[PDB]
A paper describes a structure:
The [name]/trimeric gp25, [name]/trimeric gp15, six monomeric gp16, and six wedges/heterotrimeric (gp31)2-gp32 form a compact baseplate at the distal end of the tail. The [name] locates at the innermost of baseplate, each subunit of which adopts a conserved structure: an N-terminal α-helix, an oligonucleotide/oligosaccharide binding fold, a consecutive β-strand domain and a C-terminal loop. The N-terminal α-helices (residues Met1-Arg30) of three gp25 subunits form a tripod to interwind with the tripod of three C-terminal helices (residues Pro666-Ala689) of [name] via hydrogen bonds and hydrophobic interactions. The two interwound tripods are surrounded by the trimeric [name], each subunit of which adopts an architecture different from the previously reported [name] proteins. Besides the conserved barrel domain that is commonly found in most myophages, the [name] of A-1(L) possesses three extra domains. Using in vitro enzymatic activity assays with the commercially available lysozyme as the positive control, we found that the endoglucanase and peptidase domains of [name]/gp15 can hydrolyze Anabaena sp. PCC 7120 cells. Six gp16 subunits adopt two conformations (termed gp16A and gp16B), which alternatively anchor on the [name] to connect the internal trimeric [name] and external hexameric wedge. The C-terminal tail (residues Ile126-Asp152) of gp16A deeply inserts into the barrel domains of [name], whereas that of gp16B forms a four-stranded antiparallel β-sheet with the α/β domain of [name]. Moreover, the N-terminal tail (residues Met1-Leu20) of gp16 runs downwards to recruit the heterotrimeric wedge, which is composed of two gp31 subunits with different conformations (termed gp31A and gp31B) and one gp32 subunit at the periphery. The insertion domain (residues Glu81-Gly180) of gp31A inserts in a cleft on the [name], whereas that of gp31B stretches outside to hold the LTF.
Numbering used by the authors:
A (entry chain E): 136 to 245
B (entry chain F): 69 to 245
C (entry chain D): 69 to 135
D (entry chain k), F (entry chain q): 99 to 195
E (entry chain n): 99 to 390
G (entry chain A): 601 to 714, 736 to 899
H (entry chain C): 101 to 600
I (entry chain B): 351 to 400
The structure:
Amino acid sequence: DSETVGGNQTVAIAGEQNINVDGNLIENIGGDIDQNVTGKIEVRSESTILIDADGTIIIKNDSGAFISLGGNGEVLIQDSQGRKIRLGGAFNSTWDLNGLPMAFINATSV
Amino acid sequence: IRVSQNQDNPLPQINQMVIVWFVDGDSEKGYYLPIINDANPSREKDDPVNDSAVRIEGNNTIRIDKNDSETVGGNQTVAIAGEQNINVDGNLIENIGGDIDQNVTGKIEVRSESTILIDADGTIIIKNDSGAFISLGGNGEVLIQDSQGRKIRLGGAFNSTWDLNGLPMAFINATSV
Amino acid sequence: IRVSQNQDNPLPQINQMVIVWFVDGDSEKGYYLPIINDANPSREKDDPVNDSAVRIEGNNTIRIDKN
Amino acid sequence: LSTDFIVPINFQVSDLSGTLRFYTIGNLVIPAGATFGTIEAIAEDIGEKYNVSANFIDQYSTPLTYLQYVTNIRPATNGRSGETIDNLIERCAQIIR
Amino acid sequence: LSTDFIVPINFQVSDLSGTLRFYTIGNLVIPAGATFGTIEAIAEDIGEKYNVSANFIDQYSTPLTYLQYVTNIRPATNGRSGETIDNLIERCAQIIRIRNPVSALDFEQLAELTMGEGSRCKAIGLLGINKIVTDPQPGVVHLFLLDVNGNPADPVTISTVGATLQPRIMLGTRLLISPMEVLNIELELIALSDSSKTFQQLADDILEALKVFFNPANLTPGEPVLIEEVKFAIRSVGGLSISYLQMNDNAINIPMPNQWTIPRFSYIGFELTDSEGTVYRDNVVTVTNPEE
Amino acid sequence: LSTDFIVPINFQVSDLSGTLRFYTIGNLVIPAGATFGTIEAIAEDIGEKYNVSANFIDQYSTPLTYLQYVTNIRPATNGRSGETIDNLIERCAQIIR
Amino acid sequence: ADSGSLIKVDKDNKREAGSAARTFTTGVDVPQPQIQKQYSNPRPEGASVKEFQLQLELHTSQSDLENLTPDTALYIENTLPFIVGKSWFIESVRHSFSEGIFTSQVSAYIPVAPSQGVGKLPVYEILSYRSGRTVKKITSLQQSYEHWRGTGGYTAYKQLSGFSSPVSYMKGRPNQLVYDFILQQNGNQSCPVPSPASGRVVATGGSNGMVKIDTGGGEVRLLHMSNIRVKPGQNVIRGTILGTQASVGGTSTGTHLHIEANQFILESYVQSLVTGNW
Amino acid sequence: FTPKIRAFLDTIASKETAPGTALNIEGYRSVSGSSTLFDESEMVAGGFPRSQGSKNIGRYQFTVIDYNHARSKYPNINNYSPQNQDLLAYFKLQHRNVLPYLLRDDLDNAIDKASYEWASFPGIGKPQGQFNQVQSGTTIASLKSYYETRLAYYRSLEAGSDFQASAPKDTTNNQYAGKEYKTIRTLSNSTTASFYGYNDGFDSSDLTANGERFNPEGITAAHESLPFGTLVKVTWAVNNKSVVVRINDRGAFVRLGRQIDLSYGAAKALSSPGNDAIAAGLLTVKLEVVELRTPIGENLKESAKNQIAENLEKIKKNQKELATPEISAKGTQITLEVSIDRSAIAVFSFLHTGTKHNAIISDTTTFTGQSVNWVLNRRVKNTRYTGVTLKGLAATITRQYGLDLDMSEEGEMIENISQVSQTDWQFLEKMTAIQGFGMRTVGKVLQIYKITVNAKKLNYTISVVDNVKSLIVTDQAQTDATGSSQKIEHYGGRMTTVVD
Amino acid sequence: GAFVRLGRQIDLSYGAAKALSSPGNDAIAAGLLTVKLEVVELRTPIGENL
């Protein structure tokens, strides 16, 4: 089956969409992807997951906690209260603590 | 005979019945249209009056020069035995009013070259069958756990925590602390 | 003339050929259907018998109330 | 059109009711590429009832190909059912002198 | 097309005005895959008014499937309304005296026959292959030919006339045949109109009179064109008074370059003035190209 | 075909022009499952003009069902408009001896 | 129906129909059945139209019995001027015999009196063939081998500039090269054979499918073509389908193509077969 | 101004314009021998630009002489506009015999003929073009290349992307055959095959399952399940050479996985220099199905639409038969004056339509004449009327024949009706009958009246005594069995129920 | 249109240009107008399905 649309394709489904593909799904998008989901997003694979972006990657929530894989190579792990673990985007490996204690448990031979 | 201009519908098969008109009554100017017979039986429908059942025994090719619209008041079910190839030159916008349950037997390759944004309101979990995962909690808790039970904890319930599970840690290539 | 009630298929273009019937033989009551000519040629197909090739030069709007 | 168009002589036109009918004087030749053309028309019969105002004639009975509309841009005039005796007498006298 | 096209016999074509109509001689078969095909057409009626220019006949009424265009690639020629009594007298007298083509005249009349009606010949004695008059070659007769179309003769026509005249020339004599040459005449007329004709009617009448005057049948090859004769031919139209006439940018008689050159008037400009002072200026080119 | 096929006797065939016409000698029975088979044909008229080369006859006027093509695998020969007197004399003399 | 161009078949006859002549057509509803492939139906003969009708009863004589048949032209004399001197077509003759008298009734009447080549073709594959050597695919005349000396050695071999093998030509005609090779279309040797040159077909068929073309300056000859589609006297252009390499009905169901033509025609023929531009 | 003419007019402007402006709009204001363009208002003011009397003006170098010569054929040229300059150039192409050679892509001859009009174009056999205004580097080949580039540019603008599955043909009766052998499906990517008929018992005496004699040298094969006559392309993987075989036999040996069995000739056809198919008993081949087809070409519906449109314009034209020249005294007027007591003479008029004569002894000539309505019933017409009353329709019909109309009532307004294969009298009869009217003819004038029980204005009374000789009164019962369909229409029978 | 110029698709008449004027905005005052061109056509208004 082949489908060629010289303009825009608009799909409006009031019910539930089921897609069952036995082969490979290849998506080549020449623009952007804006995915807005009101419910959950549960992705499951059983061989591998590959996430690649030439630029920056940000995984965040409304709580203000995020994992940022910088486009310059910086790595930033931030929690809601503002404690940060940083690696190296042309700086130093820094464990910013916001003036709060850090705990080691079952520490063996640090 | 066709209903539309640029429609080329599948032809009648051998031994199928058609109705033939003769323009100006000439036997040499005949125009046909297939009918429902037995070599041409009726397709199965839930509602024989309102439902549409179509089968194509060859390839199906639709080309639309202008925009396309599709409204489904119920469920849309797609079953493809081979590959699905989607090529969009513009932006792709999907708004889902429910959940997304994506089950893939093979790999998942996601490639972009500008930015990736993953955002939720609650918890985000990236886990494997090995029991190793990254949990970015909805309350701001951060958990980095491996298979054997070594975890780095940040967030709120506890303080900045590094559970080592009774295993030694290290700092290779260390200049200054 | 249409095959089903709620489809409004594209109309024949200017200079395209159609076949016309006259209800009760009246010249003022004519009903048409497009045919395959050269101003209305055949679309390219791998198998002309089983395959379906359709082109729309405008928008395509399909609305389905049920599944 | 790509070729010259001809509205034939004696082409019948009428008003909305169809009771008043005019006929073209001659052949009207609309040259290739042009769409509009003017000609003169004469009433079907004599009498003052054919003196009609502008934009009063808009129907033609015979449907010709590529012909869209017809109108009159001038009120019909000089429709008469016979001149007076005094005007005839004056005309006769002026011929004498 | 995937099949071979057929333009039927007697296919009618016409000019833009629609008054001149030509009909195809026979059926034309354009083989499948070709896009063009040529065939001869004949005028609807006799007369010199059908002698039209190239590409002047392109309108056709009956439509054929996939037929895109039709046009005459050759200017129609040999339109004749008839012959006068003196022409018929000459035709009768030549039958009286053509026994043994011996003089210049005799030779020319024979060559004009068997080459067509509307052609021309010029017979010159003792003219060698160099075409130089001062070197006479006894026993040599040189023929110069203008074909039925009014152009210098095609080699096939030369061969045909040679074969025709071979069993009629004196034994031992040498017959040379070559095409004729054409001298182009460009006219400029300044004349006063008496208003008895319109400017367009005057121009048409003058053009017709000059086309009659410069007919190769009415012209003697190698003889000078006399400007007084041209003025008389122009004025015989009537309804005008000639003020000035130029031929080839001068007012003097035009001598032909050699013995075998025929005049062929190509361009004429009109400047007609009436009593009221209206100046009508026009220009007509009659031949397709200088070397035609 | 699933059944035996019959090309009937006196079946008219011709060349591309249709001027030379042959007719089959008898019924041709193509057995079930077989597709392409052969039979003898005779010219419509006497004369040497019907002697034609192989692959020259390929048209048949009556369009029969399931029949696709016809050809001639031999050049048609022995078309004659009457023998010579000398050959007849020889034939007569040979009978005697 | 294929083009929908609404072609007209005859000059209209709007005689005594009205003064308009531009709003009506003066015809019927049912068209005539068209008989020819491309030509249109002939105009009504007119000799079937009666303009005069004459009833003739006469005392039967022997001459009026043997010479009075519908195949003769009647000439009635000593009568009205419009009857005298005209040929009357006998519609019918009747001979009655009620008693010793023979009576004749004659119904008679008077008839009314009076491009270089094709555009595009599918790509072909050309395989040079020799009786001894193996058949090899070629792209031009330069790569090939000359064919054998056929039935009396009409071939002679010369040496040319770019040919990788001796060039074969007819004896006495260096210009006229002769070759034997196999055409192919998608691997099929029963493909149609496009014409190698434009000209007039002068002779077809014969012992071995000889198509002969008169190009105006030379002759192009082709051998071993079956199912010839061109007739003698026909005009063909470059790329016209002259016939088939091998017939479908198993007429030995295999052979090559023999071609005699000059060097330029053969080179352009191979180039057009390979490229598809004609 | 198709792409060909457009490209040629560019090839002309490439050398006949001012430097730097060959495709620019400003090049339409070029001046010969000068890089300065003339006034923009001058090209529209009308006539010909007077600002430079002697110099050549325009994109194509023209003077007032060429302008007048063009106006001799195209009088609509009133000013010197880019459209008007293009039309003048097209006229010059027409007159110099450049169009016939340009329309069939003979660019050498087209340039040769155009060299007589434009001095910058070289001629055939002379790179001076019968003049000496040919610049350096200007040759016929360069002009051809420029024309090809311009034509390609013009064609690329309206280049489509659809494909055509059919091919144009001149006539519906005419038919054409396929030209390409298209692969349909792949029977087997790789299967083992063997050849039969070589050093075996299979000779020309055997019969194939087709019913044909076996030709071992033929390109044929036996397949297990394909129908006879199926064309199978067999490709040998060793040399990548493919040959099309025709399935005729069914095969005797079954073996395992043996779909096809080639003949000896078919196997020999697979051999290539250095690769002998017969050398290897078993060939690993690929099987495909091919079929005769029409090659798929570019869609030409856009050109076909233009062709249909121009044919539609051309068919509507005066192509009728001329009047027949018939010198005779037959069709004249018959005027009859008749009286019975010489008190008054009654006059009637008819048209002569027939004549009879008995010649032998009974010198008798019989003349027959008919009313003028016979003129209306002579020719069958096809026409349509819309928005016309009964009186208007009758008036037009009578005016078509020079008759007079006498009808007091206008009648109803007919909105849409078609006269299909009917004479004018028949159409008038139908229209008057459907409205309850009837016609009558006297002399030249046709009168239309209402069919009412009280319509005879004058009354004439006679007595049976002393005047009449016969009187037969008849009465019949109405029935649908007899009469015509119109008779039962006038009775109760009618289609009362109709569909909107 | 007589003048061709560059990028000139339309040329309004004097009355058409005057019809574009509004209180405080004279179209004739500005020789060149930056305008948007659309094609309109007589139509039957789209109503609720009955």
